[PDB]
Amino acid sequence: DPMVSKGEELFTGVVPILVELDGDVNGHKFSVSGEGEGDATYGKLTLKFICTTGKLPVPWPTLVTTFLMCFARYPDHMKQHDFFKSAMPEGYVQERTIFFKDDGNYKTRAEVKFEGDTLVNRIELKGIDFKEDGNILGHKLEYNYNSHNVYIMADKQKNGIKVNFKIRHNIEDGSVQLADHYQQNTPIGDGPVLLPDNHYLSYQSALSKDPNEKRDHMVLLEFVTAAGIT
The structure was resolved experimentally with X-ray
Q: Report the C-alpha gap between 21 and 90 in whole angstroms.
A: 20
Residue 60 exposure: Cα atoms within 13 Å on the Cβ side: 21
- Cβ-based neighbour number of residue 45 at 10 Å: 25
Nearest alpha-carbon partner for 150 in 183, 127, 193: 183
Q: Report the C-alpha gap between 225 and 220 in whole angstroms.
A: 16
* 17 in Cβ contact with 47 (< 8 Å): yes
- The residues, any chain, with a CB within 8 Å of residue 180's CB and separated by 6 or more, are 98, 99, 100, 101, 166
* 92 in Cβ contact with 185 (< 8 Å): yes
Q: Report the C-alpha gap between 96 and 123 in whole angstroms.
A: 11
CATH number at residue 215: 2.40.155.10
Residue 93 exposure: Cα atoms within 13 Å on the Cβ side: 14
Amino acid in position 171: I
Provide, for the chain, the percentages of residues in helix, strand and coil under a 3-state DSSP scheme, each rounded to the nearest 5.
15, 50, 35
Alpha helices in 29-153 (DSSP H): 83-86
* Residue 143 vs residues 62, 171, 209, 220, 225: alpha-carbon distances, Å: 10, 9, 10, 11, 23
* 133 in Cβ contact with 112 (< 8 Å): no
Q: Which value, to the nearest 10 degrees, does the dihedral of the CA atoms of residues 148, 176, 171, 227 take?
A: 0
Q: How many domains does the chain have?
A: 1
* 151 in Cβ contact with 198 (< 8 Å): yes
Residue 70 exposure: Cα atoms within 13 Å on the Cβ side: 35
Secondary structure element (H or E) that encloses residue 6, with its range:
helix 2-9
* 166 in Cβ contact with 178 (< 8 Å): yes
Specify the DSSP class assigned to residue 53: T
- Cβ-based neighbour number of residue 46 at 10 Å: 15
Domain that holds residue 134: 1-230
- Cβ-based neighbour number of residue 204 at 10 Å: 14
- Cβ-based neighbour number of residue 90 at 10 Å: 14
Specify the DSSP class assigned to residue 48: E
Resolution in A: 1.5
Q: What angle do CA 180, 182, 188 make, to 5 degrees?
A: 150
DSSP string, 187-206: ESSSS---PPPSEEEEEEEE
* 40 in Cβ contact with 72 (< 8 Å): yes
